[PDB]
Design a protein that fits this description.
- This protein has about 180 residues and is an all-beta fold.
- The protein is built from no helices and 12 strands.
- The protein has a 4-stranded antiparallel β-sheet, with no helix packed on it. Strands 4-1-12 form a 3-stranded antiparallel β-sheet, with no helix packed on it. Strands 6-5-7 form a 3-stranded antiparallel β-sheet, with no helix packed on it.
- The chain is globular and about 40 Å long.
- The termini are far apart.
- The PDB classes it as plant protein.
- The entry lists the keywords Plant protein, Protease inhibitor, MP-4.
- The assembly is monomeric.
Amino acid sequence: KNDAEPVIDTDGNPLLHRGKYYIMPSNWGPPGGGLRLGKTRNLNCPVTVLQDYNEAINGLPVKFNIREILPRTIFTDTELNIEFTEKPNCAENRAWSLFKGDDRGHKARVGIGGSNGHPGGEMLRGGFYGEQHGLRNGTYKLVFCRDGSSTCLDVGRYGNREGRRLGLSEAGELGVGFEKAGGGN
């Protein structure tokens, strides 16, 4: 279009696939936390990807693959399937799925695992997306495009008093910054 650039960590270098990264809360917003598999609600397997109310923990690595592949650069509009680098042993996968539309989950909640136990229930189908509609320095937003009716929506934030459950906002939210997790190759 106007037209897709490469997606950068913003420690200056284009961002890659099967590469482990972290996502910080940009520049202190608000008040910024990291993300991980966190504790929220109760027992059947934690699906809730949490954002931290504390900055000491950058959470868990984040693998942006167009998933059943290997590729070199992630340009702003190219699909992908994202997942953490280690699942709590008991949810099925670490892939992020969006549980939907009712039941006191109340937005499409960020979900790891293949079935549900507890709140909400049926995880929507779809491939993710991302990147800034940004201005002076740094990086920005990630997006989801559904299988059924989603000409895709943003991912804002919902809280619930446990931490901060990610979700699909109506407007857009989250200035996001990327920190490769290190490595060679």
